[PDB]
């Protein structure tokens, strides 16, 4: 239905 990519980006 909705094709999604969820990227996680941390910090240091």
């Amino acid at each position, epitope marked *: *239905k*909705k*094709i*999604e*990519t*969820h*990227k*996680l*980006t*941390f*910090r240091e």
Partner: nanobody, 123 residues
């Protein structure tokens, strides 16, 4: 059979309402979108509406809070109400069926994260 209409020549701060009238019903409840192109520039997404599992609407950042897309099911017509027009909105506007191929989200997390909990799926 799609037909865009309702264009004009207006002062900044004015309004126009674009219409896109469809002849059939497409795929049952697909996505209809607007895009625009100004002279010497590339095509730019403006807005889209789907009425599949309910209504969702999408907008370019530059037109949020000025433009509203809607659909009159009984006339098989999609509307783009353009308020607070600016000189930079000058273009040819087009309506077309669209498909949303992919959406990419970028989520930021900061700092140490907390205590986690283990999930083990096992017969």
């Amino acid at each position: 059979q799609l037909q865009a209409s309702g264009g004009g020549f207006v002062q900044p701060g004015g309004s126009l309402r674009l219409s896109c009238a469809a002849s059939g019903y497409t795929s049952g409840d697909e996505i209809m979108g607007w895009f625009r192109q100004a002279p010497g520039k590339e095509r730019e997404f403006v807005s889209a509406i789907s009425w599949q599992s309910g209504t969702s609407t999408y907008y370019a950042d530059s037109v949020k809070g000025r433009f509203t897309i809607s659909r009159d099911n009984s006339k098989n017509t999609v509307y783009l109400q353009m308020n607070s027009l600016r000189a930079e909105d000058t273009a040819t506007y087009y309506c077309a069926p669209m498909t949303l191929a992919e959406t990419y989200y970028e989520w930021l997390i900061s700092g140490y994260w907390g205590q986690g909990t283990q999930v083990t799926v096992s017969s």
